[PDB]
Design a protein around this nucleic acid. Sequence first.
RNA 1: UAUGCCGCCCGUCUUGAAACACGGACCAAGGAGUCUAACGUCUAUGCGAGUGUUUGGGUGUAAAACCCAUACGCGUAAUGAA
RNA 2: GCUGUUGGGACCCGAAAGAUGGUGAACUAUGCCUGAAUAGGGUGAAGCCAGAGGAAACUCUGGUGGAGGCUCGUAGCGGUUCUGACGUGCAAAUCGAUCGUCGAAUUUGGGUAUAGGGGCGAAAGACUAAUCGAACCAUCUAGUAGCUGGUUCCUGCCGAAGUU
RNA 3: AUUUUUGGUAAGCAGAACUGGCGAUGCGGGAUGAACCGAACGUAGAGUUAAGGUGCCGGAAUACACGCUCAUCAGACACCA
RNA 4: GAGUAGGCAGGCGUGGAGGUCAGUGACGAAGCCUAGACCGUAAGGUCGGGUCGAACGGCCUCUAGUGCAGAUCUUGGUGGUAGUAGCAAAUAUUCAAAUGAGAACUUUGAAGACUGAAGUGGGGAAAGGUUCCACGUCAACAGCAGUUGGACGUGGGUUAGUCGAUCCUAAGAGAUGGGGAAGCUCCGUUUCAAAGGCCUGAUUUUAUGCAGGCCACCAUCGAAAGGGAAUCCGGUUAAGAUUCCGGAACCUGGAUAUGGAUUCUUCACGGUAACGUAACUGAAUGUGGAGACGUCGGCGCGAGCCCUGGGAGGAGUUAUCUUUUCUUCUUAACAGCUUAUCACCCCGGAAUUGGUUUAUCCGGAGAUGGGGUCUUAUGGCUGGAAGAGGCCAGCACCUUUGCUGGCUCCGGUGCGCUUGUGACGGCCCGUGAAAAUCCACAGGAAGGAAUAGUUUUCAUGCCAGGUCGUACUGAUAACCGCAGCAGGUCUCCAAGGUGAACAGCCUCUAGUUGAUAGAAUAAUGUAGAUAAGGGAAGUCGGCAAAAUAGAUCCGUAACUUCGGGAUAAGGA
RNA 5: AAUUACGAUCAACUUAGAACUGGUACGGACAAGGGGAAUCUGACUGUCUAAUUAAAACAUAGCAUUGCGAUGGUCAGAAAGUGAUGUUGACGCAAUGUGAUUUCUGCCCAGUGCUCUGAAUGUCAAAGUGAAGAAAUUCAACCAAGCGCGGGUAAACGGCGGGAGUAACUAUGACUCUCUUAAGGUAGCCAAAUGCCUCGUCAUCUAAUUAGUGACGCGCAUGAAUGGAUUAACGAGAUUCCCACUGUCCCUAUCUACUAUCUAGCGAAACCACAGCCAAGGGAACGGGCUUGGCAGAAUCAGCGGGGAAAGAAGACCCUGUUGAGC
RNA 6: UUAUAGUUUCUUUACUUAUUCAAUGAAGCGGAGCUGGAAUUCAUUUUCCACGUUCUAGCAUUCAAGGUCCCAUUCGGGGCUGAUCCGGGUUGAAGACAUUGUCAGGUGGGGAGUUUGGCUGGGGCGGCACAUCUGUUAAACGAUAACGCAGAUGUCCUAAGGGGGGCUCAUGGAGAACAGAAAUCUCCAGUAGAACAAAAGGGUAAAAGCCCCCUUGAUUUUGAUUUUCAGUGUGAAUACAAACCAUGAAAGUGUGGCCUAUCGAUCCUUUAGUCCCUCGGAAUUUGAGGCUAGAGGUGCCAGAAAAGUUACCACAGGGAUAACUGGCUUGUGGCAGUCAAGCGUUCAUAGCGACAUUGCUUUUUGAUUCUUCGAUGUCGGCUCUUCCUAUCAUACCGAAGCAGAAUUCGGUAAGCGUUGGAUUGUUCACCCACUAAUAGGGAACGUGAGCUGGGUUUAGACCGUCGUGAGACAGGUUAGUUUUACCCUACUGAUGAAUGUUACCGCAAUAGUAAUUGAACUUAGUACGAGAGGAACAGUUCAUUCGGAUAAUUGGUUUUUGCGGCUGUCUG
Length: 249
Amino acid sequence: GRVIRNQRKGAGSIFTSHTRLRQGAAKLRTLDYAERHGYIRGIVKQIVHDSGRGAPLAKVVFRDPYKYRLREEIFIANEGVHTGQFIYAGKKASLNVGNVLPLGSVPEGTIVSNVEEKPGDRGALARASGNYVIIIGHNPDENKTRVRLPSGAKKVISSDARGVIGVIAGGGRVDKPLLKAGRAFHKYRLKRNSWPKTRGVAMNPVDHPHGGGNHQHIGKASTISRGAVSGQKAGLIAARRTGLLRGSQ
RNA sequence: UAUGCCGCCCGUCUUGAAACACGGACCAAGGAGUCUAACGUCUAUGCGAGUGUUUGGGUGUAAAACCCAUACGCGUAAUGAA
RNA sequence: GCUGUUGGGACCCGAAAGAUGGUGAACUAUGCCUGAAUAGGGUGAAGCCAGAGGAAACUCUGGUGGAGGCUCGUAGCGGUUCUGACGUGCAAAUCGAUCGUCGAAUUUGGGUAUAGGGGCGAAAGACUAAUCGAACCAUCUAGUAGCUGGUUCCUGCCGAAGUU
RNA sequence: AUUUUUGGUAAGCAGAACUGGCGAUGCGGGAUGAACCGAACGUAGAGUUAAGGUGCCGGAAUACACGCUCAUCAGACACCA
RNA sequence: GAGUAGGCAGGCGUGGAGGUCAGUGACGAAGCCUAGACCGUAAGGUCGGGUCGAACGGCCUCUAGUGCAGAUCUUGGUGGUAGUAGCAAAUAUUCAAAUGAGAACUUUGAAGACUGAAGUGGGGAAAGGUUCCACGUCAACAGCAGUUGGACGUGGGUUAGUCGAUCCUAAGAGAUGGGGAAGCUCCGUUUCAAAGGCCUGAUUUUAUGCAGGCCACCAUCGAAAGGGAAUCCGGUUAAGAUUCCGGAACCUGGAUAUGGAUUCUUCACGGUAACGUAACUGAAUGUGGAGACGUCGGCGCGAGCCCUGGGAGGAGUUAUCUUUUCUUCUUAACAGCUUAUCACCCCGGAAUUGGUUUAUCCGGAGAUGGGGUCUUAUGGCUGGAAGAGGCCAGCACCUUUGCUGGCUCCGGUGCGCUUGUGACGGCCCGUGAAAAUCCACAGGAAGGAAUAGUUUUCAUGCCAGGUCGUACUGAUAACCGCAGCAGGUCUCCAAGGUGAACAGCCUCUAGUUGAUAGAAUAAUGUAGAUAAGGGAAGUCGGCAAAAUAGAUCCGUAACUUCGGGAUAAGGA
RNA sequence: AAUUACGAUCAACUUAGAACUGGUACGGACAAGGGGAAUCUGACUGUCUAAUUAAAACAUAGCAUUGCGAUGGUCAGAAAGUGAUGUUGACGCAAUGUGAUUUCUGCCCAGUGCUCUGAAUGUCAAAGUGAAGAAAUUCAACCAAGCGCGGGUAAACGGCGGGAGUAACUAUGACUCUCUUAAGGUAGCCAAAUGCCUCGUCAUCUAAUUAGUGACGCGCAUGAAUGGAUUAACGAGAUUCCCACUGUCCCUAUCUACUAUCUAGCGAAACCACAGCCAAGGGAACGGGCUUGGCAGAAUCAGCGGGGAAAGAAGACCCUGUUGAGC
RNA sequence: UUAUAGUUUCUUUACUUAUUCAAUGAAGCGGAGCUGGAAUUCAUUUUCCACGUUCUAGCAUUCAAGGUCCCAUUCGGGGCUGAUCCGGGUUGAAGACAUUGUCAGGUGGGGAGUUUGGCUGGGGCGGCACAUCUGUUAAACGAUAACGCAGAUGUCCUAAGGGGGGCUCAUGGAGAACAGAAAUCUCCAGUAGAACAAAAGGGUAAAAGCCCCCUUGAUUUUGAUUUUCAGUGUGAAUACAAACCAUGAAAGUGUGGCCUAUCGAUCCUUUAGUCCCUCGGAAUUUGAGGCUAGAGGUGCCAGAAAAGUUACCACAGGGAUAACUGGCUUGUGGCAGUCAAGCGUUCAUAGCGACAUUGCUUUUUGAUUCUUCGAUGUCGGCUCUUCCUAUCAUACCGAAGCAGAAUUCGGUAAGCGUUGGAUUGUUCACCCACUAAUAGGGAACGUGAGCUGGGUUUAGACCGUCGUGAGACAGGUUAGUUUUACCCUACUGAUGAAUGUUACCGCAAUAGUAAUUGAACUUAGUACGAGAGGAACAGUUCAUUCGGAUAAUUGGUUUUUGCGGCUGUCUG
């Protein structure tokens, strides 16, 4: 049998990200002395689009404390952030929308975003459109704060891990229907080559573990094991359950 | 050449080919049981309880011919797993 | 020395295959980069302007505008039917009429990436240089064949088997 | 293929027994035919016959003898139509 | 005395080998040809005749790549079919002369035609590679012909500071440090690297040591369509020209001396202001701009073309008519002075809400109104530049060249066509490259005066611009398809009429008139057509064809996701 | 200074309106929709079998499910100081299914599969542990994961036909039992592209209909995202009927051009054992040749498609082969 | 008992330094000290308590201030602060876990390799005719086949083996309380009609059977022999011999079952035997290996280790073998007789016909496998010719339960014709309608270089059922390339040398041949008939189907491009 679409996506020839039209790596400015001990003021110089990503990027000009420059940094604009407004990044920075303070230096119940998994990561969590973390709990004894992720999972991050206050802008983007194929086409054309997906069942048995038959049908269980080899996984990997539930998910 | 009578197209597989079975338009040339190691039978030749010079040496008119020691193979004893 | 046996290309010619190591994206497939190309019409979306009606709630009219993976149709791109032409052709896929579509999921040049149990696939086992249910080149290789075909002078004598 | 013989409606079908043939076989005859009849074959001459025939084709009695048959679908040589 | 498969024996023939016949042979070896002969049951042998020209044989033995009709055998050659099939799509040729041995095909003239500016026009890209052009020539090729040719023979021809390449980066490809791998080499291109360059004077030790000091996540390749320093006109050759010549520019790199401008504390002044003027210091470093960008719909402007008027020339028609049919009347880069949407500035203080677009946006973060500032795209005029080019007339000139003079002017118009563009607007879960390169500012390092010095962002002046490509076709004959193949192959420019129109049909410019021809008009074909009456009865099936059709007015159903259906239908 | 709705001038083509006129002609050539009533099916535009299939197949938006919070998920690499996603972060990435909108999406974890805040020891490898021995060694308990056992799960694969009798009356909706493991096909739909019988039966369309449509349903073998029932618009899709139209036909005819034909020139190929008259006979059971008859006269031209079991290609169907390949 | 600190022995934590994951251009880490403002126990040697920037889209870069030495006080350049000291651990996670290495268990069609019996009236589905046994086939020795017939085996038995001894079995008859058809008892007959483990056959009467007594010949050693047969194996059997036993008074009999079936190689493993041999430098004991006889098994039974699928398919072959024709056959189908119980008022036969029975045909379907697998183009229709007659109509006849008309049954007879449509691809079928009638057939199931391509049967696709699945379906559905004649013959037409030349006019061998059917008027409302209905020959007039001509007329055709008209454009 052939190597499946799924299998040869990871070889990464044509399936690589379309990265010409993008502004750059959206990160928080590196964890440094000024952010540890005080905070730096930055100016939201412009708020720009980014291709394959449905959340505006806030290009915010900071200074260089050590040499005479203006180190420009590319953020993911929180909703209500505007042009020329002052962003404040550090431990001592005030609790306003746009500001970058460590989760330890923040009260409980805050709606934070662009959070770090490790301290000095420069943003990992709640980075997509209309998504945010809720800082549930705390503990200064073994300084590690409890947080609730957009997936609804509770994690425990260090107190020195930073995050930007408010929700990430561009929310409700998914609640409009994409519409007539071409909208999807154009959406995908600037992220990746993962579009118009052929159904394994509609292929020949060479091409997919679903192929063949005188009727289109999977034939055996679509719930595949976790221990299934890299090449065997087509359907639902390590499916705890299946089917449409009644009442609440 | 005429005349009387006779005479299906060869090769092939086949129980059975003139075959409505296969190859063949025609011609020239090329074109298919070989050599080798090891053996069975039968026969010729030598020597014959022996036999085999030629791996090697000596020699040479020089890949020839001629000469030759010690082994070695086989035979001269079989039967037993031993 | 004839005959015979076995291993060797083993009387000669013949597979579909398999293995090793290499060469192809000048065709077509998909993505990316950087370019280019597409008359004239129909219908008349939002936004906008002026009217009329009614106690009010609110409802009707005319114009404007110029939307649409809208629509007719040219170039273009395609290939439905004629099961037309041709079918030892113009051509190893063309010709003519008829037709699909024609501002986008469009058409396309150059550059660049993906190489064979691999690619690529809006999925037909499709396409990957007229080659694809596993490309092409060389080698292993004179592959093997209980199977087909062939197997070259004369005369003389003898003369079978299809059964255990 | 005659004879014995199983299956089968049957078969130029399938399968046996003994023998003889074709295969591997020309020749005379049954018009023609692998198998039937007669005979098996160096090259010739002469003579005589086999099976089969002797109106004409066609070598050979339109021979002899006793009967039968007249068909507007005569009949005519075994295997064999 | 038969005989397949098969066995065995006796011989026939071939290439070589040892021996022998003191073999044959240029007075003719071998080979081949022979309705001549003889021997042999046969395989075969022997002889005569011819052709030919250099070797060959009998016999006794040795040895083998040793004997052919078949293998859809191999290679090479040859046939019958057969002077047959055929050489029939791109509308089409015809008369005369010339040339020549020879003309349907060549050259010229004259007709008649076609392509019809989405072309059979004029350039190019990739590809080819001399096909370009001249002379000589026709054995081969151009499926007829050939005097012709993209053929054949010998030559000639491609001129660059400005066009490209060269440079920059794009998707990417790739050394390096390193790490993997038995190894071929694989990963990665900023990484767990000690990863060199920049300028000022110095100080004049036949020119070498300083420091003002700075600055550093770092090869290279990658576009003849992206980014990009700078060229235009006229003429010129058999064939080249944005290159040659003539005239005029411009750019970059470097040198420098005058003119200017600035300078009594020196780095200019003016305007309230937007900003202006010929200049009018400016290191490190930092900052910002340009390079730098979608697509579409209408709208304004510009250039070119199209239509069109008067006048100055020439040509065509003229039995009749026509103040008319045709045609020339053109202005490059570059330099100047000027020229505008937009934006901005001052005065002013708006509701009785005004200004205003085709499109409804704008105004107390200051409208309207009055007056100003700028971008110079774009136009105007001028210089270029009339001497050029064009259209003429008169005069000669043996050749080959001329000489002389004249006109080259003034309009108008637009939902026109192409095209550049400016300000807007619709669209997006799509918001539509980067780098080289260049500039500007912030900044204030350093330097600099008046009886002599500053400044090269301005004016003039001086010098240099290498290397490679450059001809030609770009296709119904130059590229790929075995070929001079009805196929395929990327673009640019684009006239008149009809008409909505770049549709179809006809013409102008320019280009071809090439596709074997002549005769005759049977069958059957192929591509076009028409048919009385009936009207799907044909047929698997209304396949094929017929009918309908543009525009204007009238009218428009079920159903509906309320957008449609819709050009419904049905009429005039 | 006395104070209106007005002149001069130049200039395109748009639509109205009337008259006149013709062999009722006028988008005069060119150009240029046939339309209507239904069913099946896919919502639509889009895409592919270059060279026999353009479709109802693929895609699609919508819907649903599954995995994953990075010391990760899916995937790559012989390896690695290696890589894709990822210049990414759940409104994301990855993996499936169904296929617009409307309406709904039932029941079944017994089986296969997947998963787990589930329980022991039922196994339970190597290394380790202990016993015996002179050692090699044999024997024992301890034994990780997974299996096994227990739960969860069907928009996971799938299944859901269930099957009998009694009873008003004349065909039975009340009783009764046993369930194929778990449930017994629910709402719906149909002789449907799924119905064998089948040309089902009834109606309708026709003079006549194995066709069409609408109903009926113990449905050989319909059915709920292996989606079921609708469904406007769309379709070079499959099908039926009607009107217009016609050489499709009754029934053929005629015309044009280019062929064919003849000529000059140039000039192939396929195929070919030898060849080329029949009838019967026998025969590898369908002869050009054989036997017996019929017969039979040079050279041939244009047609033709009866024959040459004509040509094209070592049947691709079927079998065999101790021959392979994709799956 | 613990009080030595002499190892992890096992489990609960901790340390950084290996290993590990990040990030920065390795800037600010850690500890302490200042200033805190303060903690109040109280101004401290006590321990809790921060360390310069926030309304605003500006700016922040070349060490300035004080202080100290040099510059002889020119020029400025330098020390420390400004900005706290010390440790040089860049920062932070993670940590002896993970990572990696090796080995081990699980999972692993993602992937690789390979397999997927045989016989066979084609394969497959069945079956076992594949190893065996009885009877029959089997043709009186033996041997003998088929998917021939009726059956059987993969076991069972310490007694159902061995010996000996007593008795007689099936069944019937007559009889004895309960007791009867059947419980037990007695006698009489009783050639086996019983019994002997099974299948069947053979065998057996003081036994081989049934009852009783004792045993283990169902033992040891190896050889020869018979059947199958190669005179191999295996199995079974026979007869002795040499040992040891059993029984019996003994003769004797006994090496498993009364006889004919009941079973299995090498290699491997395991057991029995034997003071055995070997382990090769020499000893011993384990251990292993040998020697002789068993057992664990191959049922495909002389003994591979083995699942599908292909409608995407492939190669070598095969007419040894299927799907079509043809050939023998004729069951089956179709047609036709003989006999005649009877049906038909009566009446066998006008017309039919039971029970039987003899055929003929090759338009069905089978049976077979002879031809073809280096292909004979595989259904139906369209077209077209010819033939068969088993006659639907027509011609002329005979018969009748024939009055007429109508119909039925036959004869000669294939001359003559035998249709138009709806649905279906269909052949077949079924309806409507006209006709004189709408008979049946053949000719490679006529006819594809004649067409068509609906069906069938390649590849795409959908549904149902089946399959875990790939896939399957002679189930349904839709889309799906139909090639070549120019050769010979045949056929149709067209020439033609030679009969001294040429011309005209003829004859006729042979071959062909063609006409067809209906209606209407009259006969005639006549015959016939109770009536109702209702003929026929003769005499006319027209039609259908066919054929051969012909073009006056009618219609069609138009390149007569004959005339006229009309549009677009070009020729002023």
